[PDB]
């Protein structure tokens, strides 16, 4: 019974059958296809630096009705263009075009977060200092 072989000389069948059914797993495939290297915008890295191209306003999806104040960024090491959310209020004033921001993942390991559609990234540092410091008036943005 039970649909799998059980004989003592049948380890090859069980081992090859486990191998074939491992591919249905989401993260086993990405570990063995190298999807992080080839397909992901960051090259399988926690962080990446970029260059700001434009300020964006993205409508929040239902049932929220705000404007999310994100930016469009082009990375240095890849040249790819990603959209990154700019956190709590006034920070879009602290970011401008061509500030060489630093980016991180947005929490959900390659997925969008909250009511923002199609943004997988956030800004951490702008002009090389912080956003927490600039928001809390602990540091000052360099004159550029």
């Amino acid at each position: 019974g039970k649909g799998k072989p059980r004989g003592l000389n049948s380890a090859r069948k069980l081992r090859v059958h486990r191998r074939n059914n491992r591919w249905a797993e989401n993260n086993y495939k990405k570990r063995l296809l190298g999807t992080a290297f080839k397909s992901s915008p960051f090259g399988g890295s926690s962080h990446a630096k970029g260059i700001v191209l434009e300020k964006l306003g993205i409508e929040s999806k239902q049932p929220n009705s705000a404007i999310r104040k994100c930016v469009r960024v082009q990375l240095i090491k890849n040249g790819k263009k990603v959209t990154a959310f700019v956190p709590n209020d006034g920070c879009l004033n602290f970011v401008d075009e061509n500030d060489e921001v630093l980016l991180a993942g947005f929490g959900r390991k390659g997925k969008a977060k909250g009511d923002i559609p199609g943004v997988r990234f956030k800004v951490v540092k702008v002009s090389g200092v912080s956003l927490l410091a600039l928001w809390k008036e602990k540091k000052e943005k360099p004159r550029s």
Partner: protein, 46 residues
């Protein structure tokens, strides 16, 4: 519309908050002495 978002009013609430300064208070004890304050203040029933 469905093309742009109005980026004009970023920071419109933090700018207009009627700010008030943190009042100076006596400092609280630190380290093992803070667990004294904590774990008597939660058990004052004599």
């Amino acid at each position: 519309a469905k093309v742009h978002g109005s980026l004009a009013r970023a920071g419109k609430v933090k700018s207009q908050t009627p700010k008030v300064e943190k009042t100076e208070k006596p400092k609280k004890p630190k380290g093992r002495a803070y667990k004294r304050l904590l774990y008597t203040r939660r058990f004052v029933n004599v």
